[PDB]
Amino acid sequence: MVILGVGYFLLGLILLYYGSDWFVLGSERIARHFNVSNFVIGATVMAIGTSLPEILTSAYASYMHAPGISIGNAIGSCICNIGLVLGLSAIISPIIVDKNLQKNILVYLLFVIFAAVIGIDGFSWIDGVVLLILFIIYLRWTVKNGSAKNNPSVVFSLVLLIIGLIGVLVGAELFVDGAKKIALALDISDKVIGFTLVAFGTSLPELMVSLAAAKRNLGGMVLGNVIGSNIADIGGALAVGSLFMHLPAENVQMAVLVIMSLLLYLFAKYSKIGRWQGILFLALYIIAIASLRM
Numbered sequence: 366m367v368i369l370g371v372g373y374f375l376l377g378l379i380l381l382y383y384g385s386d387w388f389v390l391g392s393e394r395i396a397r398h399f400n401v402s403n404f405v406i407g408a409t410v411m412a413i414g415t416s417l418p419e420i421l422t423s424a425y426a427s428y429m430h431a432p433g434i435s436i437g438n439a440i441g442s443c444i445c446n447i448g449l450v451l452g453l454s455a456i457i458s459p460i461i462v463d464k465n466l467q468k469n470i471l472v473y474l475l476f477v478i479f480a481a482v483i484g485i486d487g488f489s490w491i492d493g494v495v496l497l498i499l500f501i502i503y504l505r506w507t508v509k510n511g512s513a514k515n516n517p518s519v520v521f522s523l524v525l526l527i528i529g530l531i532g533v534l535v536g537a538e539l540f541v542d543g544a545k546k547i548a549l550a551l552d553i554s555d556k557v558i559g560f561t562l563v564a565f566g567t568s569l570p571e572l573m574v575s576l577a578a579a580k581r582n583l584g585g586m587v588l589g590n591v592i593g594s595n596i597a598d599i600g601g602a603l604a605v606g607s608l609f610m611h612l613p614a615e616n617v618q619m620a621v622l623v624i625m626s627l628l629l630y631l632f633a634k635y636s637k638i639g640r641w642q643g644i645l646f647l648a649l650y651i652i653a654i655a656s657l658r659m
């Protein structure tokens with residue numbers, strides 16, 4: 366029971382490590398197959414695939430009459446994606462954003478502000494329907510702006526992508542399951558700390574996948590994955606949460622998200638997303654996890 370926990374734990378790590386690299390390589394091949402940019406594939410397939418844990422977590426939590434966890438999980442993931450995830454990736458592989466991707470980042474920013482404003486008094490199911498529809502529009506618009514039998518190159522690509530995604534999702538659950546059975550085995554089992562573990566747990570797909578893409582100098586994909594995941598977390602995870610139950614206002618977190626999104630837009634437009642922008646993102650993330658109410 367103790368090292369069934371550690372067995373699970375290290376195995377989840379192994380699946381995350383290799384699963385994320387396969388997912389990245391498969392996604393990179395699929396992009397070239399579809400004649401779309403790495404950003405596009407990162408912002409659609411990769412973003413949605415890695416945000417599946419948040420969507421299920423938010424749905425489940427709100428269904429179980431815990432809408433605070435539902436929205437806290439969603440927004441906290443967004444902050445993590447810019448602060449920690451993009452922070453680390455930027456230092457590893459600096460990005461200079463093209464004029465086209467800037468436009469996409471600006472639309473991202475507008476979406477976040479809009480979400481922040483309508484969520485001032487919390488999110489109702491109607492807010493959810495709206496965010497979800499904007500989410501769908503964003504996807505179709507992103508694909509279009511980045512676009513234009515059985516070939517073994519394509520078949521191999523899809524298998525890389527899918528086994529890769531299975532690996533990071535299963536690996537993430539093993540990591541979280543593995544860690545929690547360790548904490549139970551050692552009687553350190555708060556769940557003041559448990560909500561911390563699954564929340565960050567849902568973020569592990571984005572983190573490992575982005576780092577993998579960062580190590581392979583695939584900056585567009587990283588940005589796409591960060592941008593799309595945040596939108597999938599609001600327009601998807603948060604939105605679905607609100608369908609089951611009204612979500613309490615998270616104005617402090619939303620404000621933090623707006624500021625980081627805004628910073629992200631400004632760097633993309635007038636400078637670069639590199640070492641010092643990355644260092645700043647991390648600083649802001651570290652300050653956030655130091656002072657936000659748990």
Ligand SMILES: CCCCCCCCCCCCCCC
Pocket residue numbers: 490494608609
């Ligand atoms: C995902 C497809 C659209 C789903 C829309 C779900 C709407 C849920 C409404 C719940 C009841 C609201 C009652 C208000 C009185």
Ligand SMILES: [Cl-]
Pocket residue numbers: 403404582583584585586
């Ligand atoms: Cl790229």
Ligand code: NA
Pocket residue numbers: 411412413414415416417571590593594595597
């Ligand atoms: Na995601």
Ligand code: NA
Pocket residue numbers: 415416417418419567568569570571
């Ligand atoms: Na995720």
